[PDB]
């Protein structure tokens, strides 16, 4: 890989029309993290409200003044929103010269700037930077992370696989005092392969382990389906460098990420044969409001 805007061609040679662009992994945040764009473009904080009450009843008799009383309360909470940005530039003899070869240099930079934009948003959403203390979904320190019941999912029979998978749902149910159900499971992709390929431990019908799709705890107690996905960055996110998987509810009241303003571009500044071009945006870090509705299982 060089940077010269030029190669030596020959007369007896046929140059192909297309150009191969090097590939990068998909974006994967849309559909898993609820994001909203409703807030005004230049806002500073997002805050919001709750309330609870408290009382006690007691045994009384025979005309006495003793009768207990109740009471109420309220509460408010806050998050912040910040600004970032990326933009390109070029020289006077980089652009008037890349039209000689029909390359359209300025037009190729804006597209790739938007691409790196989406890359940055994804990285903020799913991990943390430790500069603004934006804890991500895969490494948040407020949620409970438990180990697996001696399961490696290689040289492990289907009984262990099923027990380990339902461990997360039952643990999420037992961690919130038996009130909530896991809706969505994120697994490392290799483990998703192992599950989708291995039969159910059957000589009888050899059906795949994705019978789990209709016999898991959630889909059994209720009629609603369960969603299982395979992700990319969960290979070594565990306590001792081991794989991690996530069980959570996927509701706008559990997770929330605000993006008031999207990527835009500003006019071109010109300084001594150089065209400097800025471009800015602004977003707010991911916010896990209910940490008991997210559960980490390590060791799969």
């Amino acid at each position: 890989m060089q940077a010269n805007f030029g190669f030596v061609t020959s007369q007896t040679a046929y140059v192909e029309a297309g150009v191969y662009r090097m590939r990068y992994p998909e974006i994967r945040y849309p559909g898993l993290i609820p994001v909203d764009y409703s807030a005004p473009e230049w806002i500073k904080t997002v805050d919001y409200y709750s309330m609870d009450g408290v009382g006690k009843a007691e045994w009384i008799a025979d005309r006495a003044s003793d009768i207990p009383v109740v009471g109420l309360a309220m509460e408010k909470a806050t998050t912040t929103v910040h600004l970032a940005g990326i933009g390109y530039d070029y020289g006077l003899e980089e652009v008037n010269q890349a039209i000689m070869l029909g390359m359209n240099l300025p037009g190729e930079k804006a597209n790739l700037a938007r691409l790196v934009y989406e890359r940055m948003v994804d990285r903020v959403a799913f991990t943390g930077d430790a500069e603004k203390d934006f804890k991500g979904l895969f490494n948040n320190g407020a949620v409970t992370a438990v180990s697996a019941t001696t399961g490696n999912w290689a040289s492990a029979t289907a009984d262990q696989i099923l027990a380990d998978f339902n461990l997360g749902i039952t643990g999420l149910w037992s961690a919130t005092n038996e009130m909530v159900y896991a809706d969505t499971v994120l697994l490392p992709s290799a483990k998703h392969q192992i599950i989708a390929s291995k039969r159910l431990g059957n000589e009888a019908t050899e059906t795949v382990l994705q019978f789990l799709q209709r016999a898991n705890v959630y889909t059994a107690e209720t009629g609603r389906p369960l969603t299982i996905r395979g992700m990319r960055g969960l290979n070594t996110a565990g306590a001792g460098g081991v794989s991690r998987s996530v069980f959570y509810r996927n509701s706008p009241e559990v997770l929330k990420m605000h993006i008031p303003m999207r990527h835009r571009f500003l006019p071109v500044q010109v300084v001594g044969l150089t065209y400097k071009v800025p471009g800015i945006f602004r977003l707010g870090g991911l916010d896990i409001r209910l940490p008991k509705e997210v559960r980490y299982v390590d060791g799969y």
């Binding site: 006690k56 009768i67 207990p68 509460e75 209910l290």
Partner: protein, 166 residues
């Protein structure tokens, strides 16, 4: 839709810091707050210098200058101080009823115990500190068994003179 500080409690709590429990008698007294900062809800107060004021500083109370009473949870308090009576405000002191307060003792308290005040900070406990820094509120008693740093309700009567304990 604020789910922060969710603990998924087994059942309802008992009370808050300075809430009262209903009963026919109660001396509730209107005083004016004199401290620069506010005064918390379930707290002891001394006699001010304004002939109707009160201070949160009880470091110099004695049998000759007894404490004045205990503030109550008002719930309409100027929303600038979170749970306090701001400076220059009606204080609503109570000196006869039964009120929930905060326990500061290692081993906790049980149903019927003496109430000892630590003059240094103004915290309630079960036994005397032991360095001429504690008073006994003579007419006062507990009404709940509670551990350290928990809420317990106590019955209070401030007309009985306090007892000094060295």
């Amino acid at each position: 839709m604020a789910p922060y500080n969710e603990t998924y409690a087994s059942d309802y709590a008992f009370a808050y810091e300075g809430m009262v429990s209903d009963i026919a008698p109660a001396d509730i007294i209107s005083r004016t707050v004199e401290t620069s900062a506010g005064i918390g809800f379930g707290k002891i107060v001394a006699q001010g210098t304004s002939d109707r004021g009160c201070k949160a500083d009880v470091s110099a109370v004695s049998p000759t200058a007894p404490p004045l009473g205990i503030t109550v949870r008002s719930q309409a308090t100027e929303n600038l101080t979170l749970d306090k009576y701001p400076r220059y405000d009606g204080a609503a002191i109570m000196r006869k009823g039964v009120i929930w307060v905060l326990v500061t003792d290692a081993g906790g308290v049980v149903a019927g115990d003496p109430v000892w005040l630590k003059k240094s900070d103004g915290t309630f406990s079960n036994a005397d500190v032991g360095s001429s820094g504690g008073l006994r509120l003579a007419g006062c008693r507990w009404d709940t068994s509670a551990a350290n740093g928990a809420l317990a309700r106590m019955r209070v009567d401030f007309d009985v003179p306090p007892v000094a304990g060295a």
